[PDB]
From Swiss-Prot:
Whole sequence portion shown: 172 to 604 of 705
Function noted in UniProt: Putative Polycomb group (PcG) protein. PcG proteins maintain the transcriptionally repressive state of genes, probably via a modification of chromatin, rendering it heritably changed in its expressibility. Its association with a chromatin-remodeling complex suggests that it may contribute to prevent expression of genes that trigger the cell into mitosis. Binds to monomethylated and dimethylated 'Lys-20' on histone H4. Binds histone H3 peptides that are monomethylated or dimethylated on 'Lys-4', 'Lys-9' or 'Lys-27'.
Compartmental location: Nucleus
GO molecular function: chromatin binding; histone binding; histone H4K20me1 reader activity; histone H4K20me2 reader activity; methylated histone binding; promoter-specific chromatin binding; zinc ion binding
GO biological process, one term: ectoderm development
Record-level GO cellular component terms: nucleoplasm; nucleus
Name this polypeptide is given: Lethal(3)malignant brain tumor-like protein 2
Ranges: MBT repeats: 8-107, 115-211, 212-296, 299-390
Residues that bear Phosphoserine: 162
Entry superkingdom: Eukaryota
Keyword annotations of the record: Chromatin regulator, Isopeptide bond, Metal-binding, Nucleus, Phosphoprotein, Repeat, Transcription, Transcription regulation, Ubl conjugation, Zinc, Zinc-finger
Description of how the protein assembles with itself and partners: Part of the E2F6.com-1 complex in G0 phase composed of E2F6, MGA, MAX, TFDP1, CBX3, BAT8, EUHMTASE1, RING1, RNF2, MBLR, BAT8 and YAF2.
The organism's taxonomic lineage, starting at the top: Eukaryota, Metazoa, Chordata, Craniata, Vertebrata
Amino acid sequence: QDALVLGFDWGKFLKDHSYKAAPVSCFKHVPLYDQWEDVMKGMKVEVLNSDRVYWIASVIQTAGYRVLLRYEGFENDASHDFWCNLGTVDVHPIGWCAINSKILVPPRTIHAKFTDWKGYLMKRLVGSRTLPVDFHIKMVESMKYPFRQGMRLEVVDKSQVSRTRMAVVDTVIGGRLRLLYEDDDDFWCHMWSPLIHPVGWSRRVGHGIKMCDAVPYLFKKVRAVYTEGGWFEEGMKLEAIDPLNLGNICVATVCKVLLDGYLMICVDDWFCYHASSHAIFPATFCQKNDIELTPPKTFNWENYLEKTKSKAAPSRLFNHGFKVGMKLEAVDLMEPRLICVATVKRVVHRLLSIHFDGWDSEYDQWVDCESPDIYPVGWCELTGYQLQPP
């Protein structure tokens, strides 16, 4: 028992501490997102009986992809409750045993409760919901990814974030890509990462670049931006999450206007943000929202604009269910191969502060609520990815 070290168990973690998990419906980029919440408490499934025979269980609690199940017949007895990740093969809709010549057997723990188990189950199933038709089928289908090993793309260079660099796709897992540079070092991101781009992008838009190809339609397209009046102009001041230090929201400047609504932003090296990005904010955003602003190398915006003879980028140029204390799995964007137990520490409109459980607060990351680098509880289990414990 003590020999079998399988790593982090969300179940043992969440039971002890009465924690809430961000639900699957908060994450648009994950498997089963579009089939979810036809998952709810009291839903009935056929599952393996562990005390190959199956039995019926009911959802007591949900945490990301994982459901806490209670075998039918236990009623209020919670001592045999068990967790099930809904991305596994051995959870089924009611009726599945009948079509697959399988047999329903009560757990040995409660088998002597009733003689007429069939009648008991009938009374328990009247008006019950079960899993969708083709639920696991629609899931393995959504997890055939457009990005394949061998596809070439442009990725911002971690060592010089003001240029892109060529990379070949190496591994695809759950929409996450492992990248290898054209010229032992590697890079992990999500297929929706604003960091990756089709070949010919940088030259087209005016982005610095070090210097078969994945085609434009494989890549997440950005939002159109509407504004009455002028655009962003070089020299305009704002606030931006520092890409090199994601715990920090910094005093920043529009350093270059590129094509297609893209901007090179500098901290007062340059980094490209789209104008629709949620990682840029109008001057005084942090002050209005009780977020520590990182000043240039007692900061005050009016005084700064004055000392520097600058203007603030106008507010009109800038453009879910998460709650403080919710658990999730978060990429450590400083080492993106690592996905870790995390907690939502702050919710400020669209912005989340994600805290890595066990790690110091300096390691906290600001990310948008729709970031592709945060995942529900059970996600690493569902895809086969390794989760880092607290």
